[PDB]
Amino acid sequence: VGSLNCIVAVSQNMGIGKNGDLPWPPLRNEFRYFQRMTTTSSVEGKQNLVIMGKKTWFSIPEKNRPLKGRINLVLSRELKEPPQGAHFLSRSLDDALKLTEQPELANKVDMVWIVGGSSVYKEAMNHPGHLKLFVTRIMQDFESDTFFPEIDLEKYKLLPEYPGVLSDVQEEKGIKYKFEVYEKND
Ligand SMILES: NC(=O)c1ccc[n+]([C@@H]2O[C@H](COP(=O)([O-])OP(=O)(O)OC[C@H]3O[C@@H](n4cnc5c(N)ncnc54)[C@H](OP(=O)(O)O)[C@@H]3O)[C@@H](O)[C@H]2O)c1
Ligand SMILES: Nc1nc(=O)c2c([nH]1)NC[C@@H](CCc1ccc(C(=O)N[C@@H](CCC(=O)O)C(=O)O)cc1)C2
């Protein structure tokens, strides 16, 4: 119903996962950023929707599923029902977005947040219309087996600052990182 957004943390070499976990150790303030961004609704009375692929769902600690305070939707072409704990299942991003337009979610959902994995990000990034990418740049190389798609920097523009997002380099566990926001109006 509201805006469509992707949110990701990436290493310099564009890595987002290794062996089903993040490639870096837990960065607690970065996690809190993810939590604040995906949970905070712009409309009182509504929740945000988080959309994620099957492997991403199972990469969330069981104790944290479903992500509290958000509506959790899993994408999968083979699952018959959503994995235990998930609220919805769709076969594709387009089907998920259509679902948000139906009466069951139309008055329940505010923002839509895409939270991975790679194929889901790629699909979202190319989807027509206004889209924002909330990218945490982890300023180190990390061995990774899963990567974020390349961002077309003509098509997307980096916003110089963004309300509610810190601009300075952050550091936790000796790992420096910075929060970035990209936008297309497409
Ligand atoms: N650093 C980050 O911000 C970030 C973000 C997200 C994930 N990750 C990491 O990346 C890894 C998991 O991500 P992933 O890329 O491997 O997988 P994923 O997309 O979460 O899951 C792959 C499965 O999801 C389903 N799926 C994915 N895209 C679909 C689509 N467009 N339409 C229909 N179904 C779709 C497919 O299920 P079916 O085979 O059942 O059809 C596919 O087998 C983990 O290591 C996780 O920690 C990192
Ligand atoms: N900015 C940013 N940082 C990140 O760590 C991630 C994303 N974006 N996007 C994708 C995400 C990978 C999938 C994932 C999503 C959520 C969680 C999770 O346990 N979330 C909880 C705790 C906070 C957290 O661990 O991020 C929550 O939101 O309440 C664990 C894994 C990891």
Residues with CB under 6 A from ligand 1: 8-9, 16-17, 20-22, 52-56, 59, 75-79, 91-93, 115-120, 123, 146
- The CA distance from 158 to 173, in Å, is 27
Note if 22 is an active site residue. Answer: yes
Counted residue by residue, the chain has a size of 186
Burial of 77 per CB tally in 10 Å (0-12, 13-18, 19+): exposed
SS3 letters for 88-126?
EEECCHHHHHHHHHCHHHHCCEEEEEECCCHHHHHHHHH
Tokens matching residue 125: 């990034």
| Contact partners, residue 39, CB within 8 Å, separation at least 6 | 48, 67, 68, 69, 70
Annotated binding-site residue? 123 = yes
- To 10 degrees, the CA torsion angle through 74, 123, 112, 142? 80
For the CA of 136, the nearest atom of ligand 2: 1
Separation of CA 167 from chain center: 20
- In the chain, domain spans: 1-186
Rounded Cα–Cα distance for residues 96 and 127 (Å) = 13
Q: Which ligand is nearest to the CA of 60?
A: 2
How many whole angstroms separate alpha carbon 148 and alpha carbon 10?
7
DSSP structural state of residue 139 = S
Q: Is 48 within 8 Å of 112 (Cβ atoms)? A: yes
44 is annotated as an active-site residue: no
Q: Which residues pair with 180 in a beta bridge?
A: 135
Into which CATH architecture does domain 1-186 fall? Answer: 3-Layer(aba) Sandwich (3.40)
